[PDB]
Design an enzyme around this catalytic site. Sequence first.
Site, mmCIF file in Angstrom:
data_model
loop_
_atom_site.group_PDB
_atom_site.id
_atom_site.type_symbol
_atom_site.label_atom_id
_atom_site.label_comp_id
_atom_site.label_asym_id
_atom_site.label_seq_id
_atom_site.Cartn_x
_atom_site.Cartn_y
_atom_site.Cartn_z
ATOM 1 N N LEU A 43 -10.612 -36.094 5.839
ATOM 2 C CA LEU A 43 -11.164 -34.933 6.522
ATOM 3 C C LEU A 43 -12.208 -34.194 5.682
ATOM 4 O O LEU A 43 -13.058 -33.504 6.241
ATOM 5 C CB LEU A 43 -10.048 -33.967 6.954
ATOM 6 C CG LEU A 43 -9.003 -34.527 7.898
ATOM 7 C CD1 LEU A 43 -7.842 -33.543 8.078
ATOM 8 C CD2 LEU A 43 -9.611 -34.909 9.253
ATOM 9 N N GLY A 44 -12.145 -34.330 4.361
ATOM 10 C CA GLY A 44 -13.104 -33.660 3.491
ATOM 11 C C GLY A 44 -12.710 -33.694 2.038
ATOM 12 O O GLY A 44 -11.632 -34.179 1.687
ATOM 13 N N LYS A 47 -13.966 -28.724 -4.144
ATOM 14 C CA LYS A 47 -14.103 -28.689 -5.598
ATOM 15 C C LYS A 47 -12.785 -29.124 -6.255
ATOM 16 O O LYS A 47 -12.805 -29.717 -7.338
ATOM 17 C CB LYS A 47 -14.452 -27.248 -6.048
ATOM 18 C CG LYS A 47 -14.971 -27.136 -7.486
ATOM 19 C CD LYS A 47 -16.447 -26.721 -7.554
ATOM 20 C CE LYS A 47 -17.389 -27.897 -7.686
ATOM 21 N NZ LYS A 47 -18.808 -27.460 -7.751
ATOM 22 N N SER A 49 -9.795 -30.607 -4.255
ATOM 23 C CA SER A 49 -8.956 -31.633 -3.623
ATOM 24 C C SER A 49 -9.709 -32.513 -2.634
ATOM 25 O O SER A 49 -10.829 -32.189 -2.260
ATOM 26 C CB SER A 49 -7.781 -30.958 -2.917
ATOM 27 O OG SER A 49 -8.247 -30.182 -1.826
ATOM 28 N N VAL A 51 -8.904 -34.067 1.138
ATOM 29 C CA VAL A 51 -8.000 -33.757 2.239
ATOM 30 C C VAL A 51 -8.004 -34.875 3.256
ATOM 31 O O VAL A 51 -9.076 -35.338 3.642
ATOM 32 C CB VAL A 51 -8.348 -32.375 2.863
ATOM 33 C CG1 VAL A 51 -7.472 -32.073 4.063
ATOM 34 C CG2 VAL A 51 -8.242 -31.239 1.824
ATOM 35 N N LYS A 66 -3.307 -33.009 0.973
ATOM 36 C CA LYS A 66 -4.309 -32.458 0.064
ATOM 37 C C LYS A 66 -4.010 -33.072 -1.306
ATOM 38 O O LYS A 66 -2.991 -32.747 -1.924
ATOM 39 C CB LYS A 66 -4.160 -30.922 0.078
ATOM 40 C CG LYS A 66 -5.002 -30.141 -0.879
ATOM 41 C CD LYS A 66 -4.775 -28.653 -0.608
ATOM 42 C CE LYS A 66 -5.547 -27.760 -1.530
ATOM 43 N NZ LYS A 66 -5.437 -26.328 -1.117
ATOM 44 N N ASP A 154 -8.831 -15.690 -0.990
ATOM 45 C CA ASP A 154 -9.855 -16.552 -0.412
ATOM 46 C C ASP A 154 -9.845 -16.490 1.098
ATOM 47 O O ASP A 154 -9.952 -17.507 1.794
ATOM 48 C CB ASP A 154 -9.748 -17.982 -0.963
ATOM 49 C CG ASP A 154 -10.977 -18.849 -0.764
ATOM 50 O OD1 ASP A 154 -12.087 -18.281 -0.629
ATOM 51 O OD2 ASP A 154 -10.842 -20.096 -0.885
HETATM 52 N N1 LIG Z 1 -2.936 -28.043 7.916
HETATM 53 C C1 LIG Z 1 -4.158 -28.428 8.296
HETATM 54 N N2 LIG Z 1 -4.332 -28.912 9.553
HETATM 55 C C2 LIG Z 1 -5.528 -29.408 9.892
HETATM 56 N N3 LIG Z 1 -6.637 -29.494 9.150
HETATM 57 C C3 LIG Z 1 -6.445 -28.986 7.923
HETATM 58 C C4 LIG Z 1 -5.268 -28.448 7.429
HETATM 59 N N4 LIG Z 1 -5.423 -28.055 6.109
HETATM 60 C C5 LIG Z 1 -6.667 -28.367 5.836
HETATM 61 N N5 LIG Z 1 -7.347 -28.924 6.887
HETATM 62 C C6 LIG Z 1 -8.741 -29.360 6.854
HETATM 63 O O1 LIG Z 1 -9.087 -29.576 5.493
HETATM 64 C C7 LIG Z 1 -10.174 -28.709 5.103
HETATM 65 C C8 LIG Z 1 -9.660 -27.486 4.368
HETATM 66 O O2 LIG Z 1 -8.928 -27.799 3.159
HETATM 67 P P1 LIG Z 1 -8.581 -26.674 2.012
HETATM 68 O O3 LIG Z 1 -7.135 -26.470 1.736
HETATM 69 O O4 LIG Z 1 -9.165 -25.332 2.506
HETATM 70 O O5 LIG Z 1 -9.341 -27.095 0.667
HETATM 71 P P2 LIG Z 1 -9.565 -26.539 -0.817
HETATM 72 O O6 LIG Z 1 -8.213 -26.073 -1.518
HETATM 73 O O7 LIG Z 1 -10.082 -27.676 -1.719
HETATM 74 O O8 LIG Z 1 -10.529 -25.406 -0.819
HETATM 75 C C9 LIG Z 1 -10.898 -28.421 6.414
HETATM 76 O O9 LIG Z 1 -11.819 -29.461 6.735
HETATM 77 C C10 LIG Z 1 -9.738 -28.326 7.411
HETATM 78 O O10 LIG Z 1 -10.150 -28.621 8.741
HETATM 79 MG MG LIG Z 2 -10.324 -23.725 1.765
#
Ligand SMILES: Nc1ncnc2c1ncn2[C@@H]1O[C@H](COP(=O)(O)OP(=O)(O)O)[C@@H](O)[C@H]1O
Ligand SMILES: [Mg+2]
Length: 327
Positions: A43-44, A47, A49, A51, A66, A154
């Site tokens: 999904l992405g 910096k 992780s 996901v 993650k 955040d």
């Molecule tokens: N529980 C979830 N359900 C669906 N998509 C999620 C979920 N958690 C994260 N995502 C997806 O993953 C990304 C957000 O991950 P995130 O925890 O915010 O990252 P980081 O800690 O590296 O900043 C987005 O693209 C979001 O759509």
């Molecule tokens: Mg985030």
Amino acid sequence: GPVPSRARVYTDVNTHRPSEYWDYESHVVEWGNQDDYQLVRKLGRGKYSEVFEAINITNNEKVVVKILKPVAAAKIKREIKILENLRGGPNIITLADIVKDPVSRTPALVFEHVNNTDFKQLYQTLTDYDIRFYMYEILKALDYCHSMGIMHRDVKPHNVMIDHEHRKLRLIDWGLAEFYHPGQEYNVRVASRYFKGPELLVDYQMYDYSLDMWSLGCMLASMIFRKEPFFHGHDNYDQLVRIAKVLGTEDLYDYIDKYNIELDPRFNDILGRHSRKRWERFVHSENQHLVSPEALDFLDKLLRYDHQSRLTAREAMEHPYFYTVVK
Ligand SMILES: Nc1ncnc2c1ncn2[C@@H]1O[C@H](COP(=O)(O)OP(=O)(O)O)[C@@H](O)[C@H]1O
Ligand SMILES: [Mg+2]
Ligand SMILES: N#CCc1n[nH]c2cc(Br)c(Br)cc12
């Protein structure tokens, strides 16, 4: 030097909980089975992780994994402890498991999957009623985590997932969250640029839960005024100038004076002199459907330089802006 500050609410919640609650370094991680999860699609990558969408093969349910990067692998115990502490709370994302990823050899956090509505779609289509409804839902998550002695640090639209079909909201991404301890000096390199509170931009380290209420105000202003983001700084310095063009420089100098803060001299040539603008300056034909006197008053009480003067999440829930929301 700077005058100290402490939160006006939930000041001593961590002092009265056993050490085990906040002493995240001493926490012993319970590891699950990585084979229960089959990765489906990336999904992405941030910096900290990578996901993935995955399936929990023990129940065929969708989950999100993650996988932490080595840089993140240091303060992973803090995110884990916060997630376990808040588990089951209102609108807090559920940490389903913690497994060791066989490829990265780093911890992989397994979360409940949210079938979230696209963020641009949410920004473009939520109605006046929807904004109030969802703001009330995020306030339940913030009052809960603040009452639990934690600041999110955040808050921003991408960390507030909405499954619009089921009118379901989850506050995610607890990687920057911290336990609030009165008198503690925190790192100001938190939150995303457009959501950074004035305390971070003037380098005031003794901040608290109220930082999250500034960030929520920034989200509200963008939503009701149709301006993404509301305070569009070109960097962390210009971010403060953008805020001062709206709230004025006089209240900024009063805030700096009250906490005996030494403003970076690089602001001397860029801050200028600005008056406070009345919130109706931002109203136009394309956002009038989202603006009301109650929305403006509520916003006004969130976006204050003095972090001690902002509404708390619990006071915010008492505001007239939410009277129309079915409870
Ligand atoms: N529980 C979830 N359900 C669906 N998509 C999620 C979920 N958690 C994260 N995502 C997806 O993953 C990304 C957000 O991950 P995130 O925890 O915010 O990252 P980081 O800690 O590296 O900043 C987005 O693209 C979001 O759509
Ligand atoms: Mg985030
Ligand atoms: N901005 C924007 C869209 C968006 N993403 N997450 C949200 C949470 C809330 Br609460 C609201 Br209102 C709007 C959004």
